[PDB]
């Protein structure tokens, strides 16, 4: 994922969902099946 398509995916910048729980970084890829 580009970073502009990471962010229309799981509707964040890719430093926000980095400063997440790894435990709901992991879900939250299960949700989006990526």
């Known amino acids: ?3 502009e398509d990471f962010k229309a995916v799981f509707g964040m910048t ?3 969902f980095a400063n997440l729980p790894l435990a ?3 879900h939250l890829k299960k949700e989006k099946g990526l």
């Open 1 to 3: 994922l580009s970073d």
């Open 14 to 16: 890719r430093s926000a």
């Open 24 to 26: 709901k970084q992991q």
